[PDB]
Amino acid sequence: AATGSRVTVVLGAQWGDEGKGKVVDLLATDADIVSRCQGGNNAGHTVVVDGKEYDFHLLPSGIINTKAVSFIGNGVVIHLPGLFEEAEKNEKKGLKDWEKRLIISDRAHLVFDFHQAVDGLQEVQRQAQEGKNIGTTKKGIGPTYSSKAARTGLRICDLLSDFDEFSARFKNLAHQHQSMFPTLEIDVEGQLKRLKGFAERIRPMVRDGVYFMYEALHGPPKKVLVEGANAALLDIDFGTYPFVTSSNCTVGGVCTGLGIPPQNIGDVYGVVKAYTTRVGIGAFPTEQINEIGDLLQNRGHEWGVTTGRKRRCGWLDLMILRYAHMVNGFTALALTKLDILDVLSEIKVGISYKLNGKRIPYFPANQEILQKVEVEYETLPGWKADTTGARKWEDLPPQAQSYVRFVENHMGVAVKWVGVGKSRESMIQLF
Amino acid sequence: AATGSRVTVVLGAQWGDEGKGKVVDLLATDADIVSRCQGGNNAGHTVVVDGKEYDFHLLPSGIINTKAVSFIGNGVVIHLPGLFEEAEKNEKKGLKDWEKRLIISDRAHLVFDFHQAVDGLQEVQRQAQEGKNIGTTKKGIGPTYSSKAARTGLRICDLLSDFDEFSARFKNLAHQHQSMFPTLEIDVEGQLKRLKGFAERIRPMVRDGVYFMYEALHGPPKKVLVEGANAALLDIDFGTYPFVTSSNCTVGGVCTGLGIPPQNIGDVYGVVKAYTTRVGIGAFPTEQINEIGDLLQNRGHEWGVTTGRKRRCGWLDLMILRYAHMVNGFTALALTKLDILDVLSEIKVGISYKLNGKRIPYFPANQEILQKVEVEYETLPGWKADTTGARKWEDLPPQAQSYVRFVENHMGVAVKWVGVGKSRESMIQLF
Ligand SMILES: Nc1nc2c(ncn2[C@@H]2O[C@H](COP(=O)(O)OP(=O)(O)OP(=O)(O)O)[C@@H](O)[C@H]2O)c(=O)[nH]1
Numbered sequence: 099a100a101t102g103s104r105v106t107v108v109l110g111a112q113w114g115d116e117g118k119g120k121v122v123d124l125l126a127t128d129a130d131i132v133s134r135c136q137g138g139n140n141a142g143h144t145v146v147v148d149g150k151e152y153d154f155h156l157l158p159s160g161i162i163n164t165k166a167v168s169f170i171g172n173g174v175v176i177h178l179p180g181l182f183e184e185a186e187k188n189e190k191k192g193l194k195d196w197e198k199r200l201i202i203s204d205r206a207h208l209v210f211d212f213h214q215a216v217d218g219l220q221e222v223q224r225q226a227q228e229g230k231n232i233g234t235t236k237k238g239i240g241p242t243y244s245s246k247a248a249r250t251g252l253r254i255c256d257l258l259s260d261f262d263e264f265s266a267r268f269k270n271l272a273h274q275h276q277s278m279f280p281t282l283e284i285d286v287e288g289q290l291k292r293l294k295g296f297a298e299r300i301r302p303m304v305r306d307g308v309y310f311m312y313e314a315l316h317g318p319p320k321k322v323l324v325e326g327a328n329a330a331l332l333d334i335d336f337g338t339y340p341f342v343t344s345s346n347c348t349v350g351g352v353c354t355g356l357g358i359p360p361q362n363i364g365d366v367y368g369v370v371k372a373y374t375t376r377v378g379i380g381a382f383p384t385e386q387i388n389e390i391g392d393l394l395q396n397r398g399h400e401w402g403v404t405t406g407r408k409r410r411c412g413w414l415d416l417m418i419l420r421y422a423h424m425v426n427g428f429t430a431l432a433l434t435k436l437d438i439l440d441v442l443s444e445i446k447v448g449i450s451y452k453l454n455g456k457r458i459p460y461f462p463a464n465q466e467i468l469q470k471v472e473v474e475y476e477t478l479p480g481w482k483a484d485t486t487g488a489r490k491w492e493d494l495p496p497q498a499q500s501y502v503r504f505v506e507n508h509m510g511v512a513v514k515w516v517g518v519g520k521s522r523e524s525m526i527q528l529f
Numbered sequence: 530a531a532t533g534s535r536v537t538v539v540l541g542a543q544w545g546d547e548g549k550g551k552v553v554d555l556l557a558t559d560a561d562i563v564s565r566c567q568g569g570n571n572a573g574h575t576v577v578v579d580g581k582e583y584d585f586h587l588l589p590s591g592i593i594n595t596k597a598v599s600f601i602g603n604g605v606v607i608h609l610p611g612l613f614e615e616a617e618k619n620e621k622k623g624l625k626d627w628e629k630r631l632i633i634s635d636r637a638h639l640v641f642d643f644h645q646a647v648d649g650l651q652e653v654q655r656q657a658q659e660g661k662n663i664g665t666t667k668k669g670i671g672p673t674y675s676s677k678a679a680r681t682g683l684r685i686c687d688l689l690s691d692f693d694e695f696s697a698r699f700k701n702l703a704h705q706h707q708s709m710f711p712t713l714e715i716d717v718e719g720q721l722k723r724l725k726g727f728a729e730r731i732r733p734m735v736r737d738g739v740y741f742m743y744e745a746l747h748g749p750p751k752k753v754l755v756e757g758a759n760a761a762l763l764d765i766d767f768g769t770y771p772f773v774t775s776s777n778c779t780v781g782g783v784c785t786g787l788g789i790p791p792q793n794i795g796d797v798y799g800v801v802k803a804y805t806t807r808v809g810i811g812a813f814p815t816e817q818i819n820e821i822g823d824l825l826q827n828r829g830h831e832w833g834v835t836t837g838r839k840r841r842c843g844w845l846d847l848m849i850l851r852y853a854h855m856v857n858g859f860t861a862l863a864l865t866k867l868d869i870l871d872v873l874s875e876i877k878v879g880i881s882y883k884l885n886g887k888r889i890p891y892f893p894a895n896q897e898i899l900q901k902v903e904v905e906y907e908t909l910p911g912w913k914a915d916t917t918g919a920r921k922w923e924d925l926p927p928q929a930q931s932y933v934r935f936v937e938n939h940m941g942v943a944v945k946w947v948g949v950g951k952s953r954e955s956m957i958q959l960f
Pocket residue numbers: 110113114115116117118119120121141142143144328329434435436437438516517518519520521524
């Protein structure tokens with residue numbers, strides 16, 4: 099085939115925390131290349147191997163495989179210190195020779211220190227005095243993307259090129275920022291100095307990302323895995339704007355983040371949690387602010403890993419799911435946390451939205467509208483049984499099998515994996 | 530097929546002005562839907578029908594077909610006045626009932642008046658006193674994209690929703706801009722008033738863009754045409770940054786600009802000019818600052834339609850072409866302006882780049898490097914004959930046929946069309 103190898107993609111289908119990491123780790127085992135095409139939220143990911151716990155943010159989970167190549171695409175924004183700070187932390191815990199299995203596209207944009215600063219203050223103004231919240235902060239993701247949009251930002255390739263031309267551009271950049279932000283403090287020579295140090299440290303891992311992926315996809319058959327960032331509803335274009343990240347968290351982001359054509363996209367897996375969760379303020383049609391939600395919240399341990407803030411919980415919402423599929427064209431699904439529902443007598447599933455009495459066939463773009471929809475539910479009987487031990491389709495009880503079919507049928511996408519626990523063994527592959 | 534209809538895409542393979550419009554107009558004839566997925570540069574496009582000349586910028590060329598639906602995807606940034614100003618201009622020249630054949634995704638971002646202003650001054654600072662140039666201006670494209678990145682911008686859906694919540698957000702936005710830009714003048718109540726007027730005027734043409742395209746692609750077989758903006762080397766991620774637009778001008782942009790999955794992408798045509806042209810400063814490996822370039826410049830009428838500024842001309846450059854294919858996965862090519870070369874005795878074609886003596890297999894990301902490459906040429910004999918009258922492969926002379934094969938072979942992509950003139954008849958379809 100002239101096409102060559104097609105990449106396998108894992109994307110979140112809801113508002114994140116679906117359990118993508120579990121699907122990625124399971125697939126990263128026999129993958130030749132494990133990559134990240136979009137930075138997104140740079141949310142954290144914990145991986146356990148041979149008795150060691152690792153924490154990755156910018157680094158692909160697959161960096162664990164010493165037999166695979168880890169690749170950061172051009173679509174990921176990178177903060178040098180944060181990167182090495184992350185590399186060093188995991189290294190001193192077991193990760194060895196990572197600098198020999200990590201490749202970085204030279205077209206990736208750089209998140210400078212002042213970006214994080216401009217991002218740290220914007221929040222202490224936008225929502226520091228009874229203001230509305232939006233996305234993450236102190237990471238400087240948005241600001242970096244803003245610089246990219248303005249064609250004012252700097253990339254890895256620029257850093258590794260003539261440092262004289264880089265310095266002049268960096269200064270100009272920081273200058274413009276101090277203009278738009280008078281209360282912004284920038285240790286110019288200090289940062290510029292720390293960067294030149296970073297340039298040399300990173301240079302051996304940088305390559306032309308487009309040529310690198312093209313070669314990998316057109317040489318002998320290879321297995322490339324792309325771990326999607328965040329989820330569909332957190333997508334800059336398609337998520338519940340403005341409560342979204344600054345990058346595409348959907349399938350198109352694979353093409354723009356790696357520089358590969360659509361024909362080189364193969365399996366696209368949608369990770370669907372058996373119920374819905376969301377972080378922060380915003381419309382949440384199926385939200386359950388009652389005993390059910392507390393139960394899903396508790397049994398699912400739905401709270402920020404670091405802050406401990408509880409996540410909002412609600413019933414599975416098919417309108418979100420179908421929308422995510424329209425955009426991503428999932429070829430298969432990974433239904434996770436089915437076990438959380440082991441305890442319920444009946445489970446509700448939102449099947450459609452009604453607006454001013456009438457049923458609408460689309461997922462509303464604006465918040466005000468999305469906040470007004472009336473959910474139409476379909477009550478299903480529960481299995482009232484422990485599924486944590488199931489390891490095959492036949493092990494699941496009749497009402498649980500029906501729950502899975504219900505998802506497949508209404509989404510038009512087959513379920514390939516059913517998650518019944520945290521351990522990688524607690525995953526059932528249906529085909 | 531579960532996939533449904535696959536869209537046909539036309540993309541520029543070089544630095545723009547390749548002749549995409551000719552390929553689009555030829556295809557828009559029997560297309561059910563003609564759309565734009567990314568605004569990009571909002572460059573102009575002239576179309577002639579029944580004795581009337583139209584000028585489209587935001588409006589898809591296919592709006593000419595009264596039997597087709599014109600669609601502006603979520604990836605296009607829109608300036609309301611500019612839009613109606615464009616609609617009205619063409620309407621008073623023949624375009625009638627356009628408001629009945631035009632659909633607009635409600636997820637499309639809005640280019641407000643102050644965006645254009647912040648963009649008009651940034652240029653009168655960045656390169657108004659011996660400064661370097663970059664992209665277009667006075668359009669406020671970049672600034673709009675910056676607002677998008679910050680999740681601070683407003684979209685069509687927001688405008689059509691509760692105007693009270695819109696006004697508060699608009700004011701907040703304009704406020705932030707006056708903070709970052711003290712010399713920025715904003716007639717808040719004046720603009721906010723003109724918008725409410727715009728909201729009602731545009732409301733009847735707005736729809737949920739994701740649902741609209743999904744339906745069109747999964748209902749009975751339809752023919753959707755996507756006219757790409759600008760070209761590959763003007764791509765924000767993949768073009769010769771910083772000399773590029775603020776949006777993806779490549780195939781991935783189709784997915785992110787329309788919200789359709791990769792499997793719904795069918796034919797992707799790369800428009801390749803028989804020689805290379807570029808607008809503005811920047812590295813140009815095959816540039817010919819001599820009699821050849823003057824000749825290509827003159828015979829090809831390579832100058833800005835409005836400003837009359839001459840465009841830089843050079844030999845066909847295969848490194849740019851192959852790069853564009855790595856990223857876009859062209860299924861077929863449209864080789865244009867072959868006739869411009871009718872007069873040469875021998876034609877040169879850059880086949881590879883050498884760097885510090887060695888041949889590099891990739892297209893350099895950074896300008897400084899790209900400016901240092903040494904081009905390796907392949908001299909080919911010319912046909913020295915008038916091809917403007919050719920209408921089939923057999924009409925082309927032997928050296929011209931070879932020129933076409935040379936392009937196909939070294940790009941690995943078949944040539945489907947050969948352009949030998951301005952008239953739509955001056956196009957040869959090879960298969
Ligand atoms: N009980 C149960 N827990 C699960 C299942 N699948 C995943 N989890 C847990 O859910 C939590 C979510 O972690 P991840 O798998 O990293 O999910 P995520 O997709 O990375 O979320 P973000 O990357 O932050 O968007 C982990 O603590 C998992 O152990 C499942 O089938 N059952």
